[PDB]
C-alpha cells in the first residue's frame, strides 16, 4: 500500500503491549520486521532497542543461524547506514564465525572479503590490529589477500601507493556496492583515502625525526592543507607528533622529550643489567657447567 510509518506504526508495538516475548521466534521475526520497517523508515532506533535486546537470545536459541543471519543482516544493514566499520565488520565477524560453521567458507568469504575490507574501511581498529592475521585468513583461496596484503601493506605503507592500489584493485575490491554502500568507491576510496593516508602517517610517524612538508607531500601525494589537516587531524587527535611549521616548511616529527626518559631509561639501562647480568649472569657459570667438561 506504500504505507510506511503507519505500517511500521501498527507494528511499532510488539515488544511491549504484545509478547513479553512469550514466543520470541514469532516475535523476533516482527522485531526483525520492525527493524526492517525501521529501515524503510530509516530509524535504527526502532531497530536498535529490538536489535540490542534480541540477538544474544538467538545465540541463546539452539542458536538459529537464520535468526542471527536475518538479524545479522539487519545488523549489517544497521551497520550499513551506520558506516562504523569495526562495528560493521565486528557484527559480521560474529556470525561470520557462524557461517563457516553454517555456510561454506565460499559463501562465507565475501563477508570476510568485506569484513577485513570493512576493517580497512574503518579508519582502523585495535582489534583490527589483532584481527590482522586471524589464521586461515587470506582464507587461502580468493584474494581476500591484497585485503590482508594491504593489512600487510600497512607496516610498509607509502601513499605513493594510494592511486596505484586503487587502480590496482577494484574488481570488487575498491569497487563495491555489494554488501557495502559505496555508491562511488568514496565510501571505500575516500574513506580509505585518509585511511591509507592515516596508516601511512603511522610508519611515517615511526620513521621521521624530521621531514619537510614537501618530502611528505612528495611521499604523501597531497597538498599542504590536506597534509596539514591530516597532520592537524592526528595532531588534533594527539595520535601523532608533528610541528606546525610553515616558516621552515618542514615538520619536526618531534618526540615527547620530557618523559624524563632516563627515569625509565637509566632504570632501563639498569633494566638492561636487570636483564643482562641478571639474565646473562645466571646462565654463564651454569652454562659451561651445564656443558661441564
Amino acid at each position: 500500500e506504500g504505507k510506511i510509518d503507519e505500517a511500521a506504526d501498527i507494528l511499532c508495538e510488539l515488544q511491549v503491549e504484545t509478547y513479553g516475548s512469550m514466543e520470541m521466534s514469532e516475535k523476533i521475526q516482527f522485531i526483525l520486521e520492525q527493524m526492517e520497517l525501521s529501515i524503510l523508515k530509516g530509524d535504527y532506533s526502532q531497530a536498535t532497542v529490538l536489535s540490542r535486546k534480541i540477538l544474544k537470545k538467538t545465540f541463546k536459541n539452539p542458536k538459529y543461524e537464520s535468526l542471527k543471519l536475518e538479524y545479522y543482516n539487519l545488523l549489517v544493514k544497521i551497520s550499513l547506514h551506520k558506516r562504523e566499520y569495526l562495528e560493521v565488520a565486528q557484527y559480521l565477524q560474529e556470525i561470520y564465525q557462524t557461517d563457516a560453521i553454517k555456510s561454506d567458507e565460499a559463501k562465507w568469504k565475501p563477508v570476510l572479503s568485506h569484513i577485513v575490507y570493512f576493517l580497512v574501511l574503518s579508519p582502523y581498529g585495535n582489534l583490527q590490529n589483532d584481527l590482522i592475521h586471524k589464521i586461515q585468513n587470506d582464507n587461502n583461496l580468493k584474494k581476500l589477500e591484497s585485503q590482508e596484503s594491504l593489512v600487510k601493506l600497512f607496516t610498509t605503507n607509502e601513499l605513493m601507493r594510494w592511486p596505484i592500489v586503487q587502480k590496482t584493485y577494484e574488481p570488487v575490491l575498491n569497487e563495491d556496492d555489494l554488501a557495502f554502500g559505496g555508491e562511488a568507491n568514496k565510501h571505500h576510496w575516500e574513506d580509505l583515502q585518509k585511511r591509507v593516508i592515516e596508516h601511512n602517517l603511522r610508519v611515517i610517524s615511526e620513521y621521521y625525526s624530521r621531514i619537510t612538508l614537501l618530502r611528505l607531500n612528495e611521499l604523501l601525494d597531497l597538498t599542504e592543507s590536506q597534509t596539514e589537516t591530516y597532520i592537524s587531524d592526528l595532531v588534533n587527535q594527539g595520535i601523532i607528533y608533528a610541528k606546525v611549521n610553515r616558516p621552515a616548511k618542514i615538520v619536526n616529527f618531534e618526540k615527547p622529550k620530557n618523559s624524563s626518559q632516563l627515569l625509565n631509561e637509566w632504570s632501563h639501562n639498569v633494566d638492561e643489567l636487570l636483564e643482562h647480568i641478571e639474565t646473562i649472569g645466571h646462565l654463564i657459570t651454569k652454562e659451561e657447567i651445564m656443558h661441564g667438561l
Binding site: 587461502n140 607496516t155 610498509t156 610508519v203 615511526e206 620513521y207 621521521y208 625525526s209 624530521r210 621531514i211 619537510t212 618530502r215 618542514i250 616529527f253
Partner: protein, 376 residues
C-alpha cells in the same frame, strides 16, 4: 642376497619361528624375486637393516607375526620401514591403500606408539600433497596432536617438521619452511641416519629455501652446520655458496652473471640482494662502524656507503621495518637516519677484555665509597 636369503631364513625367519616368512609360498617369493642383493626388507635386525629398495611384497610377509606383533617383534617396528620404506614406494593410491589399513590396524586392532604412526599415516598423506588444504588441515591437527605431546622421538617432529616442511615444501613461506626445515634439521640433528641424495637435496632445497626464504637475513647460518660439503660442492650449491658470498659480497653481477632460470625464477632476490646489500652493508656498518655507542649512520653518503644509491636509500634506507627490520627514523632535512636496535650480530676476542675493565673499574673504585656506608 645373504642378508635376505641367509638373513631372511636365519634372520627372522626365526625371531620368530614357524612364521609366514619361511613359509612355503613365503621363502619362494623372495627367491622368486631374488637372492641378488636387492630385496624386500627382511624381518627384524636385518630388515632393521634392510630398507631394501626392491619393493617389499613381503609387504604381506612383514605383515605376518604382526598379529603376533604383541608377542613377536614388537616396537614401533613397522613405520621403521614400509610406512617408511614403502612410503617411499612412491605411488599415489599405494600409500592411501595401506594408510587406512596400518592406521586402523596398529591403532585399532592392535590398540583396541600409534601417534608416530598417526603422523606417518597423516604425514605420509601429505607427501601426496593431494591439496595443501586437506594437508594443513589435518597437518595442523597432526601439529595440534603433536603440540601437547612430550614425545621421546624427535622422529615425531622428524616426521612432522619434515612433514610440515613438506607442506611448506609444496609452498613458498620458506621464511617459515626453510626455518621449518631448519627446525627439522635441528630435529634430525640427533638421529635418523639418512642418504646424501636425502641429505644435500633437502639441504639444497633448504639452502634453496634460504633463497626463497631471504629472510630476516641471514647473512650467516646453519651453513656452519654440516649442510656444507654436503651441499657445496657445486651446481646450484656453487651459487648457494656464491650466494653465501653474495650474502657477504652483495654484488649483483657477481651473481646476476650466474643467474639461470631457477634463481631468476624468483627474480625478487634482485630486490633481496638490494635488501641484502643494504642490510649486509648495514649489519657491519651497524655492528662496528660507530662502536662508541653505535647508532647514527645518517643517512645518505653513509647510506650511499652501502653503494646502493641515494634515491633508493630514499626507499631502502627509508624503509626500516618496511625492511621488516630497522628501527629509528628519518631527518629528511639534515639527511639523518634515526636508528635504533633490531640489529643482531657476532665475532669474538675484542670487547671481551673491555668488558670486565670498566665493570671492575667502578667496582674497584666503588669500594672507596663502598667502604663503610651501611657497615658504619
Amino acid at each position: 642376497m645373504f642378508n635376505n636369503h641367509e638373513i631372511d631364513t636365519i634372520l627372522s625367519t626365526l625371531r620368530m619361528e614357524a612364521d609366514p616368512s619361511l613359509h612355503p609360498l613365503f621363502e619362494q617369493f623372495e627367491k622368486f624375486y631374488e637372492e641378488k642383493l636387492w630385496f624386500q626388507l627382511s624381518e627384524s635386525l636385518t630388515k632393521f637393516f634392510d630398507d631394501a629398495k626392491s619393493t617389499p611384497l613381503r609387504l604381506r610377509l612383514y605383515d605376518n607375526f604382526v598379529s603376533k606383533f604383541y608377542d613377536k617383534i614388537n616396537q614401533l617396528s613397522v613405520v621403521k620401514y614400509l610406512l617408511a620404506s614403502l612410503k617411499d614406494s612412491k605411488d599415489f593410491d599405494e600409500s592411501l591403500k595401506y594408510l587406512d589399513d596400518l592406521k586402523a590396524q596398529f591403532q585399532e586392532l592392535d590398540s583396541k606408539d600409534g601417534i608416530l604412526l598417526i603422523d606417518s599415516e597423516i604425514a605420509r598423506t601429505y607427501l601426496l600433497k593431494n591439496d595443501l588444504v586437506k594437508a594443513r588441515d589435518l597437518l595442523d591437527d597432526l601439529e595440534k596432536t603433536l603440540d601437547k605431546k612430550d614425545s621421546i622421538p624427535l622422529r615425531i617432529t622428524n616426521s612432522f617438521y619434515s612433514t610440515n616442511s613438506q607442506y611448506f615444501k609444496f609452498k613458498n613461506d620458506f621464511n617459515s619452511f626453510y626455518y621449518t626445515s631448519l627446525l627439522y634439521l635441528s630435529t634430525l640433528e640427533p638421529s635418523t641416519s639418512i642418504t646424501l641424495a636425502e641429505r644435500q637435496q633437502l639441504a639444497y632445497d633448504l639452502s634453496i629455501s634460504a633463497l626463497l626464504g631471504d629472510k630476516i637475513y641471514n647473512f650467516g647460518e646453519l651453513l656452519h652446520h654440516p649442510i656444507m660439503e654436503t651441499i657445496v660442492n657445486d651446481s646450484n650449491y656453487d651459487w648457494l655458496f656464491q650466494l653465501l658470498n653474495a650474502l657477504t659480497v652483495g654484488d649483483f653481477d657477481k651473481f646476476d652473471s650466474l643467474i639461470k632460470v631457477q634463481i631468476s625464477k624468483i627474480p625478487i632476490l634482485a630486490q633481496h640482494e638490494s635488501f641484502l646489500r643494504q642490510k649486509i652493508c648495514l649489519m657491519t656498518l651497524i655492528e662496528t662502524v660507530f662502536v662508541k655507542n653505535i647508532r647514527m649512520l645518517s643517512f645518505e653518503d653513509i647510506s650511499k656507503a652501502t653503494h646502493l644509491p641515494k634515491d633508493n636509500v630514499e626507499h631502502l634506507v627509508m624503509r626500516a621495518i618496511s625492511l621488516g627490520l630497522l628501527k629509528g627514523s628519518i631527518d629528511q632535512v639534515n639527511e639523518l637516519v634515526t636508528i635504533s636496535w633490531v640489529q643482531p650480530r657476532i665475532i669474538s676476542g675484542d670487547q671481551i677484555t673491555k668488558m670486565k675493565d670498566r665493570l671492575v673499574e667502578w667496582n674497584d673504585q666503588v669500594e672507596k665509597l663502598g667502604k663503610k656506608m651501611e657497615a658504619r
